[PDB]
Structure 1
Amino acid sequence: DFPRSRLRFKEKLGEFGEVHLCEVDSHPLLVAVKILRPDATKNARNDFLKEVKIMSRLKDPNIIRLLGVCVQDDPLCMITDYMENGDLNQFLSAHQLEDKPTISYPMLLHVAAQIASGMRYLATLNFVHRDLATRNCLVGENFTIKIADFGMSRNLYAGDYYRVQGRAVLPIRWMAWECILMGKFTTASDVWAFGVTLWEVLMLCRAQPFGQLTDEQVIENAGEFFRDQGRQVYLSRPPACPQGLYELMLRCWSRESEQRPPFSQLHRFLAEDALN
């Protein structure tokens, strides 16, 4: 529950808490195991226990799945699926769009449809992710995608978060205008972050959203959405993205939260309409 002795620690996969590739004899069975740092504070331990609880809610092919736990003894462990290809941002970065390692346009749509399906599931639970982005997705065998949430602290993605002393850490470049101005999050702001995530996929993660603008400019842009005088600025159409699919992204960035398409409609478009 889970038998900790059945675990065989093999390699470190990354870094609050280390993640390790482990083997389970059942024989070539691989899992990911997250362990609390030896010097974790009482606050870190509490957060870890809550992550376990939140994660235990989530049961979908395109969401990270809690396979097991070791909490009745120290140190605390969380066990998930091992996703061979690591995070989606690093994965796409190592690929180029097929001409005429490579990835094809239809494969990009399949990646995006899987994210939409995972988010469709979350919406059914009335669960708001709050930090959807390619950096929070993992890639397994055969371009299979699982949405996760690594938190906001990793050095690699430091530049994706706006930090003011004593305030919540904010992924402003993925955030709906109402999130920036009022600091609250909904399924409708998850849709907006999905539009930005889809922009990243079609960019093959080559540039930060609004990359040529400062943090302060991105925040003032939310103000311009609010005022609605036609001065707001949008992510440009990626090279690999045709106009029809771009117009979908634009609906995700509608000023009015109710005008943003539900994830059920987004999934339909990506899995069906976008095929023609």
Structure 2
Amino acid sequence: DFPRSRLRFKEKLGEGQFGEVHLCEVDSHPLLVAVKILRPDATKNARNDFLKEVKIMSRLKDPNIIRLLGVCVQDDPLCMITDYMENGDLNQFLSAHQLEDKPTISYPMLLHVAAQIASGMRYLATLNFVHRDLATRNCLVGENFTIKIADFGMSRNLYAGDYYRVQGRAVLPIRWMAWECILMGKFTTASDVWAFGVTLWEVLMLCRAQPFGQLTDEQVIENAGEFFRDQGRQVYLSRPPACPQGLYELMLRCWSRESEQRPPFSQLHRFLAEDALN
């Protein structure tokens, strides 16, 4: 519950802020798991953060959310054990595919991927859990095209350009952030909805471009001010070439100026699983 000696470390999968993820083998033939441990330079602050993440993760029980399989909080060394997701994060996965003409992925499959994210988010909503960093870099692919939402410390490292860093401030995914988050730092379910729109845009781009990729960080922050001013000078992500107009309009609703006018995840799921099929 759970004995450490049964873990055979295989390869480093990546490195976060207080943690590090390795592929491991379990001997009771061989089961593969992903194991998050403290980094070698871990401090007391890191240990505390690790213990809090166990607490948060122990609550989360849904098919489309990362699952905690097992733990060491018992005796050190600390670890979290989760499912090994053979196909990596969603960003890597989609980047390695092209859209089917007429390794490939179909448009109905992109919808299925996005519907699974929406369902994960619907679960989190019911718990009044705000994610704060929804993006494809934070989703895992298991196949048979199983998507699980996670929150990786390591995302901040391998996707450094996706985060706006000022000394003494929190590290902010500004390109995925609702205008009111950029201007006020008020993170809500409604700002998760906005980030879901951006995430959906990424899925439809097959992760080929950063959101507002031709614009600087400052222009992105200035753009949020334009939402606030509401003088019809705000700018939006363009329609992906794979995206039909009806699906684009769903994205646009995620990006409503008013929080309350953004669709709940129940509705987003329904649209992506049913309405989008026509």
| TMscore range, shorter length | over 0.9
Deviations 1:46-75 (A, max 9, x none): 111111111011000000000000112222
Q: Does structure 1 retain, via aligned residues, the 8 Å contact 2:193–2:254?
A: yes
Question: TM-score, length-normalised on structure 2?
Answer: 0.97
Match of 1:140 among 139, 142, 161: 142
Could you tell me whether the CA contact under 8 Å between 2:19 and 2:153 is conserved in 1? no
- SS of 1:246's partner is helix
Q: Which runs of 4+ in 1 moved over 4 A?
A: none
TM-score (norm 1): 0.98
Uncovered stretches (5+) of structure 1, i.e. residues with no partner: none
The Cα RMSD (Å) is 1.1
**Could you list the per-position Cα deviations for residues 233-265 of structure 1 after superposition, in whole angstroms to 9, with x for gaps in the alignment?**
000000000000000000000000000000000
Shift, 1:183, TM fit: 0.7
Task: Give the distance between the partners of 1:107 and 1:30, measured in 2 at CA.
Answer: 26
Residues in 1 aligned to 2:175 and 2:154: alpha-carbon distance in whole angstroms: 13
Distance 1:119 1:188 in 2: 11
Are the aligned partners of 1:38 and 1:75 in contact in 2 as well (CA < 8 Å)? no
Shift of 1:4: 1.1
Following superposition, the deviation at residue 129 of structure 1 comes to: 0.2
Task: Find the counterpart in structure 2 of residue 225 from structure 1.
Answer: 227
Question: By how many angstroms is 1:20 displaced?
Answer: 1.3
Q: Secondary structure at the match of 2:144?
A: helix
Q: Are 1:245 and 1:274, in contact at CA under 8 Å, matched by a contact in 2?
A: yes
Q: Deviations over 1:84-119 (max 9, x none)?
A: 001110110010001111111000000000000000
For the 8 Å contact 1:18–1:34, the answer to whether it is kept is: yes
For the Cα contact (< 8 Å) 2:137–2:155, is it kept in 1?
no
Distance 1:171 1:113 in 2: 22
Shift of 1:6: 2.1
Q: Is the 8 A contact 1:152 1:169 kept in 2?
A: no
Structure 2 Cα separation of the partners of residues 39 and 156 of structure 1? 19
SS of corresponding position for 1:141: coil
Q: Find the residue that maps to 1:114 and give its secondary structure.
A: helix
Partners of 1:9 and 1:153 in 2: CA distance: 21
Q: Distance in 1 between matches of 2:203 and 2:185?
A: 26
SS of the residue aligned with 1:44?
A: helix
Compute the displacement of 1:9 (Å). 1.7
Q: What is the identity percentage for the equivalent residue pairs of Structure 1 and Structure 2?
A: 100
Contact 1:152 1:158 in 2 (8 A): no
Say whether the 8 Å CA contact 2:138–2:149 is kept in structure 1.
yes
Q: Which runs of 5+ in 2 are unaligned?
A: none
Deviates more, 1:5-14 or 1:209-218: 5-14
Superposed displacement of residue 153, structure 1: 6.3
CA distance in 2, matches of 1:19, 1:243: 40
